[PDB]
Design a protein around this nucleic acid. Structure first.
Length: 319
DNA sequence: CATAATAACAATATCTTGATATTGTTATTATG
């Protein structure tokens, strides 16, 4: 329980914003900075509650998801400045109704998605383009292609992936590689944090490994390698968004616009269509090749958004 | 006038059962 501390990263993002050529003012980070500053020397729990009530009063008219994210930022700032043993962490949090409502909305959306699958008609063309991206010299393209072939998150692919050959007896497997650098684990006890596990690929392993070798040994590749989430989000996110938008404009399902993370979803689908053993469940296989938490089958529910045209045909044939 | 750069604004999917870490989209800035 310290009374002193400073959220270093936030203030750094503030001072790196004063001499910007253009762009929004870091008003939220200012809010947080003044918050942490006002927290210095505070031992009056009531006044802490008043401060947080002020901060909450500020977020009004903003989306619930947005408010939740902001609260996450605040809590991480408090943890950075004062530590995990600070009473404010039990004050600076959203009311339970907000989280319960968010969960309800999430479950509702997932249910609706399972009730109305999107037929990925031109998925072979998408996998083909994504295969062609592996032979490009542009690190961005190679990254997109690696997302497509390995089903790793953009953050994983560009920043912290560790692809290595997977043994197949004495030789080397053709349709599987080893992966290390799982994200969003939060260093869970039963997660793939720092765990090298085997994943299937949608092309021959040699091509993937070679393309990734050309990725890491590039300039932009070593700029990306080891980045934080915010660095990458500010560096590549919009460019990646536009590039992905253009790459799969007229082959992507008409219902939705082509987003990068979709390449993961799709991946799983076809990864289940061409590699899945008969003694496992689709949920189990998804949770296996995606590197989900131990004994978790509920996260896999979020990836079942598409359906392959062949399966659609084999289900239409029911007459 | 005007289009590029930036962080607000927002939603998703993961570990966990109340939140965090990601991915995704838009309003606002300086500036020239």
């Amino acid at each position: 329980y310290p009374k002193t501390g400073v959220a270093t990263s936030i203030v750094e993002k503030i001072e790196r914003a004063e001499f910007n050529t253009a762009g929004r003012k870091p008003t939220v980070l200012l809010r947080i900075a003044d918050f942490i500053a006002a927290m210095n020397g505070m031992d009056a729990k009531q006044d802490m509650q008043a401060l947080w009530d002020a901060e909450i009063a500020i977020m009004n008219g903003r989306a619930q998801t947005t408010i939740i994210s902001y609260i996450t930022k605040y809590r991480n700032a408090i943890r950075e400045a004062f530590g995990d043993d600070h009473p404010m962490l039990k004050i600076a949090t959203g009311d339970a109704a907000m989280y319960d409502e968010a969960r309800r909305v999430k479950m509702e959306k997932i249910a609706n998605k399972h009730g109305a699958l999107i037929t990925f008609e031109n998925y072979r063309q998408v996998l083909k383009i994504c295969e062609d991206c592996l032979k490009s010299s542009d690190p961005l393209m190679i990254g997109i292609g690696l997302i497509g072939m390995t089903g790793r998150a953009p953050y994983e692919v560009f920043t912290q992936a560790e692809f290595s050959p997977a043994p197949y007896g004495k030789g080397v497997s053709k349709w599987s590689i080893l992966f290390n650098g799982q994200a969003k684990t939060k260093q869970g006890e039963g997660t793939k944090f720092g765990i090298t596990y085997e994943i299937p690929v949608l092309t021959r392993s040699e091509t993937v490994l070679a393309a990734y070798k050309r990725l890491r040994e590039s300039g932009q590749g070593k700029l990306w390698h080891g980045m934080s989430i915010d660095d990458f989000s500010s560096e590549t996110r919009l460019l990646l968004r536009d590039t992905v938008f253009n790459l799969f404009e007229d082959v992507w399902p008409k219902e939705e616009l082509p987003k990068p993370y979709g390449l993961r979803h799709l991946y799983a689908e076809v990864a289940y269509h061409n590699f899945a053993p008969p003694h496992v469940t689709k949920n189990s296989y998804f949770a296996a090749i995606l590197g989900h938490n131990n004994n978790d089958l509920e996260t896999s529910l979020s990836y079942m958004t598409y359906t392959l045209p062949e399966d659609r045909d084999n289900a239409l044939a029911r007459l």
